[PDB]
Design a protein around this ligand. Structure first.
Ligand SMILES: [Cl-]
Ligand code: NA
Ligand code: NA
Length: 242
């Protein structure tokens, strides 16, 4: 029932997506932790690099992002490529496809070097521009696996270092990972990005914010940390998605 889903998503709204992002989502929690142990510019660069290698993991996303945050806390990172050349083969949760993953980091090194504090601010105010800068640095389609995710994670990191919140653009689609694809197959025969773009347009909640609502809940995150009115909306959503 796409209409019912859009209604509940719209009731949750940007404010509800933001509450979930900032209080429930373990990937955000991992980022906030890392931000206390490394400088803001290096933090953002690392988040983008990490996102672009966050596929075909040897663990769940929550475990992987916590491993990343703990690994880099307090480290003196002089080259992001060399840091990942050391990190990935010693990691618990990202041991596979290392050559391909390192080649992606190599391709974005020059782009990452442009991320001064001001450039980060500018990209947070125009995430559609960031999306293309990342995709073109890699030389891949804007919609290929991890690219949209890297914009999502940038938005978490930028919120943390800039202390301000800019909603994601409506035009950036959801990430099509296992959790979202599996949920979507239970709801519809439509392809996930098309189904969720319709719900985004009907609700006015951008797809990346819908993803932020859904992804932690699909991982079994509790909703009892939400304030009462939001908790009731999330309970309604859980009936649909779990
Ligand atoms: Cl492009
Ligand atoms: Na920081
Ligand atoms: Na993605």
């Amino acid at each position: 029932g796409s209409h019912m889903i859009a209604r509940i998503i719209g009731e949750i709204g940007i404010e509800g997506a933001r509450f979930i992002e900032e209080n429930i989502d373990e990937q955000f929690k991992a980022l906030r932790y890392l931000s206390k142990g490394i400088d803001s510019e290096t933090f953002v660069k690392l988040v983008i690099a990490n996102s672009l290698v966050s596929y075909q993991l040897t663990g769940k996303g929550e475990q992987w992002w916590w491993e990343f945050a703990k690994y880099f806390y307090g480290r003196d990172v002089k080259s992001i490529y060399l840091a990942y050349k050391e990190f990935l083969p010693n990691s618990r949760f990202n041991r596979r496809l290392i050559p391909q993953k390192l080649s992606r980091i190599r391709r974005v090194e020059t782009f990452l070097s442009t991320l001064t504090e001001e450039r980060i601010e500018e990209y947070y105010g125009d995430m559609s521009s960031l999306w293309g800068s990342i995709a073109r640095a890699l030389g891949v389609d804007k919609e290929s696996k991890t690219v949209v995710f890297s914009v999502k994670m940038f938005g978490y990191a930028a919120r943390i270092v800039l202390s301000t919140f800019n909603p994601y653009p409506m035009e950036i689609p959801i990430p099509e990972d296992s959790r979202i694809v599996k949920l979507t197959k239970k709801l519809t025969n439509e392809k996930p990005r098309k189904f969720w773009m319709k719900i985004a347009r009907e609700s006015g909640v951008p797809p990346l914010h819908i993803d932020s609502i859904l992804w932690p809940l699909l991982g079994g995150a509790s909703i009892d940390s939400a304030p009462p009115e939001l908790r009731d909306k999330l309970a309604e959503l859980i009936k649909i998605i779990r």
